[PDB]
């Protein structure tokens, strides 16, 4: 809730 | 301080984002790296969790207003997860200044 987790890595 | 409070995530071999710790992010010139670099100081013990040069051609991607995500090398993906959008914006602006981008971009390179 405090820190979002990434969805995918960058391209 | 909380504006620069972050969690560092790193993508592992199993393609899970591993939580590498909470800390505070800044930028500064690092001589041994010959350029402006992102530094994350750990809340745990004050060590540098991250010391990452902002290369001119790295594709940094801003996700969900509070994530800055990039490839730090071959098979090496990192993400800074910001507690506050305002802090994310500050670091994003610095990345954009180093690379020469309009800070309204959501990715600093094409493709």
Residue numbers in the entry:
A (entry chain B): 1055 to 1065
B (entry chain A): 4 to 114
Relevant lines from the article:
The major form of PP4, conserved from yeast to human cells, comprises PP4c in complex with R2 and R3. Flfl14, the R3-type subunit of Drosophila PP4, has been shown to bind Miranda (Mira) and so recruits PP4 (PP4c–R2–R3Falafel) to regulate asymmetric division of neuroblasts. Here we show that Flfl directly binds the centromeric protein C (CENP-C) and brings PP4 activity to centromeres.
To better understand the molecular basis for the Flfl–CENP-C interaction, we co-crystallized an amino-terminal 122-aa-long fragment of Flfl containing the EVH1 domain (Flfl1–122) and the CENP-CFIM peptide and solved the structure by molecular replacement to 1.5 Å resolution as described in Methods. The final model comprises residues 4–114 of Flfl and 1055–1065 of CENP-C. We found that the Flfl1–122 fragment is composed of a seven-stranded β barrel capped by a C-terminal α-helix. The binding site lies in a highly conserved groove on the surface of the protein burying 1,700 Å2 of the total 6,700 Å2 surface of Flfl1–122 and corresponds to the surface responsible for binding proline-rich sequences in other members of the EVH1 family. Residues 1055–1065 of the CENP-CFIM peptide are well defined in the electron density, and include FKKP motif of the residues predicted to interact with the Flfl1–122 by peptide array analysis. The peptide backbone adopts a left-handed helical conformation similar to the polyproline II (PPII) helix28. This arrangement is mainly stabilized by the establishment of hydrogen bonding and van der Waals interaction between Pro1060 and Trp20. Additional residues flanking the PPII sequence provide directional specificity. In our structure CENP-C′s Phe1057 and Pro1060 provide the principle specificity and directionality of binding (see also the legend for Supplementary Fig. 2e). We suggest that Flfl–FIM interaction constitutes a novel mode of EVH1 binding in which a low proline content ligand is recognized in a PPII conformation.
